[PDB]
Design an enzyme around this catalytic site. Structure first.
Site, mmCIF file in Angstrom:
data_model
loop_
_atom_site.group_PDB
_atom_site.id
_atom_site.type_symbol
_atom_site.label_atom_id
_atom_site.label_comp_id
_atom_site.label_asym_id
_atom_site.label_seq_id
_atom_site.Cartn_x
_atom_site.Cartn_y
_atom_site.Cartn_z
ATOM 1 N N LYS A 22 0.706 -1.055 -0.061
ATOM 2 C CA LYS A 22 0.370 0.104 -0.253
ATOM 3 C C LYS A 22 0.858 0.855 0.080
ATOM 4 O O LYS A 22 2.168 1.277 0.536
ATOM 5 C CB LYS A 22 -0.963 0.281 1.045
ATOM 6 N N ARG A 55 -2.428 -10.190 5.249
ATOM 7 C CA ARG A 55 -3.287 -10.359 3.684
ATOM 8 C C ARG A 55 -2.149 -9.751 2.576
ATOM 9 O O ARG A 55 -1.754 -8.451 2.849
ATOM 10 C CB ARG A 55 -4.206 -9.459 3.150
#
Ligand SMILES: Nc1nc2c(c(=O)[nH]1)N=C(CNc1ccc(C(=O)O)cc1)CN2
Ligand SMILES: Nc1nc2c(c(=O)[nH]1)N=C(CNc1ccc(C(=O)O)cc1)CN2
Lengths: 265, 265
Positions: free
Chosen positions: A210, A244
């Site tokens: 991210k 994740r």
């Protein structure tokens, strides 16, 4: 430390022995042979590299119609669950989309709006008896107190889930890194992850590649492997049950080193 | 949090802003052009990839004579300090070897026997006023209580250093991962790193590529990058000031992500 296994229909996930790794499956656009074949090869690859769950879902990062999302995602699930012996979570917030996915063979729900998008999803979860991941999210970022407000907001998801019939043991929480949070707020959430534990549910952490990582390291998306490493390590040390990730091989070895050290397993 | 900088002659190291990275310089066998030239290129490379200190020293992992170790290591220091503007630590336990290294231009001492090998080293440290790293080590592994005994053993090094004239501000401690410790004891030390903090000195951690990582991951030395990652991440979270690594590019980005998150800097 957990007195229960995570029950996933065909499969069973033990929460005490290791950090469980959920591999992100990119849905590159359904039905066509190229698309479903490349998704299967990628799922087989992730299974080979140490993944414990496959996370199938695209369109989050646009606004597509629901009857289409199914055409896209249903064939993907039928194929992967047939050829990769592993639990599949469906990454949607929509109630009608979730229903299909479990019907097509998917085992966990992964809601990025924590039942606030379409409260009726939690009813789908209760009915098929699947585990559900409730993620922190909100249509704004006007936080009085980041952590205090996350925990409040998350508890509003639980309330919706539980009043829908969902059992405590089928509930996983997620702090929703990258969602309605500035780069600096994301760090604070990371720094204070261990707080979500007071709520008494297993926590999944999603930080793979991210942009807040990029913001710290000043580095584009393909150079975010070490940064992800650090977030996964701090996560596990703060009591995460699942991570994740995209880079299953690498993250999977880090999780294992973390497990050895923190005394997990 | 530290009211003092680490004073290194020409250079100055701030202990509050970031985890400081010490890059391991392999001495592949002195004097010859090939050897000194490849060492310089490797030091330049490590500086380019985010290293803050160069650690020069070989023969630990044999038993060479002292007058030789100097022939090996003195030319290495003269070259690197001339062409790489960075502090150099000398990795020896021998008093006569250390003396030469600082005379040749080296800035920190790195003693793997924490002044117990040749107590006279600590006198060399006091005299040139260099910082010294005191590592935990012992000729056996018959521990009553691992952590309690480490802290005791380390404090015996400090006692020797301080009674030699060494100032508190020139003292760095190191738990000595891989030294006189079973694979399972190494994990315990990692798990309990934060204890060394009670002693009130900066702590350096050295775990790069070591075999206890291999033992957990069942993986040879060239596949130990992720495992090292985890040890460096847990280390920093437990309050480490320095890390001693081979893979400077990667470890340096992880340290930086760790720093952002833990609120350091
Ligand atoms: N349970 C769960 N599901 C997800 C998650 C997540 O973190 N947890 N993240 C996703 C990716 N969303 C992003 C948000 C921000 C960024 C970024 O800032 O780069 C990238 C991706 C989608 N699905
Ligand atoms: N201050 C400091 N100096 C060192 C260190 C260290 O950890 N700290 N380690 C070194 C490497 N020694 C090893 C020990 C064990 C292993 C292994 O078990 O693979 C590898 C290398 C040498 N010099």
């Amino acid at each position: 430390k957990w007195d229960y296994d995570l029950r996933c229909g065909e499969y069973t996930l033990n929460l005490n022995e290791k950090t469980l790794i959920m591999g992100i499956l990119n849905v590159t656009p359904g039905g066509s042979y190229n698309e479903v074949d490349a998704a299967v090869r990628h799922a087989k690859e992730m299974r080979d590299e140490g993944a414990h769950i496959i996370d199938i879902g695209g369109e989050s990062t646009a606004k597509v119609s629901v009857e289409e999302e199914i055409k896209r995602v249903v064939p993907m699930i039928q194929a992967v669950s047939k050829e990769v012996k592993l639990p599949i979570s469906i990454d949607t917030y929509k109630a009608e989309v979730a229903k299909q996915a479990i019907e097509a063979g998917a085992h966990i729900i992964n809601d990025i709006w924590g039942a606030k998008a379409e409260p009726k999803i939690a009813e789908v979860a209760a009915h098929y008896d699947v585990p559900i991941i409730l993620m922190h999210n909100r249509d704004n970022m006007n936080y009085r107190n980041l952590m205090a407000d996350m925990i409040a907001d998350l508890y509003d998801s639980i309330k919706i889930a539980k009043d829908a019939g969902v059992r405590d043991e089928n509930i996983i929480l997620d702090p929703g890194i990258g969602f309605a949070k500035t780069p600096e707020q994301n760090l604070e959430a990371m720094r204070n992850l261990e707080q979500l534990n007071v709520l008494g549910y297993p926590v999944l952490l999603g930080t793979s590649r991210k942009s807040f990582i990029g913001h710290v390291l000043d580095l584009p998306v393909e150079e975010r492997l070490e940064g992800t490493g650090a977030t996964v390590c701090l996560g596990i040390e703060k009591g995460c049950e699942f991570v994740r990730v995209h880079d299953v091989k690498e993250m999977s070895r880090m999780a294992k080193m973390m497990d050895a050290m923190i005394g997990k397993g």
